[PDB]
Write a protein that binds this ligand. Sequence first.
Ligand SMILES: [Zn+2]
Lengths: 7, 292
Amino acid sequence: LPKKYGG
Amino acid sequence: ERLLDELTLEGVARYMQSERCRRVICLVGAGISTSAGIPDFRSPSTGLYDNLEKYHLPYPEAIFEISYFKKHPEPFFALAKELYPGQFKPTICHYFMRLLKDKGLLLRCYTQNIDTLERIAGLEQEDLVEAHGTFYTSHCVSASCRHEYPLSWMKEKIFSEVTPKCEDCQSLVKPDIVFFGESLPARFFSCMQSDFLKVDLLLVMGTSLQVQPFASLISKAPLSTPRLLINKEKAGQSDPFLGMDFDSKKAYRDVAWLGECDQGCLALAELLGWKKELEDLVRREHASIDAQ
Ligand SMILES: [Zn+2]
């Protein structure tokens, strides 16, 4: 799964 | 050539009471909880990254990064005590979504918020996609244990300034919010793949649609599906430097109601004939919470 980032 | 007879709140209300509008998805952000006293945690004006000096972080964002938290959790939990709400009273907007649920209209609420107010207002786990997790539950971080703890347990640890540790294995216990560097919830992608095949109306409330992947949800609706934005500011339009179309001659399905989210939800409920039901629900639930 994609990781959480600022944008 | 369009499902809305006009691009107004009145057009949306007439559509909602037509045979075609069966399944509503709500997309909600910080704007639906500010009137409950919950600040926007992704707003620089909240000042989360200020006053971090005593923690000697390698970079300000480390206080919300998972790898840093797991080795140095004390800064996060000190900040959590500072920001912990004094009351959890959901807003008119939250109870409007409960009315949608009661009337068989709510397919799903996708929320960016971590404050649990959707659940307090009566939305159930099945109704919710908490895109950034929630404080509602916490878990031991050890992969072989994963003991679950309720918010009452976590609140007590935060307020006593005791770093929360698992009673089974003494590992750190973390609120179920998605820290930076953690995987986004599998449920977000699973539900998105199913729900947007089925949606008749998108209600986009209290989000500026600036954080991905949440903001991309508006592009997952079928081309015909009306999209109502209830928000203090217009949002979701394409960036001219690099979407919602409210105002062009080609606009056909997107409506912006600009104002406080509670007032927009009240206006929509009033058009639907639900104002007394919503007032009665809110006043009863607020009285119940005040009496705790
Ligand atoms: Zn454990």
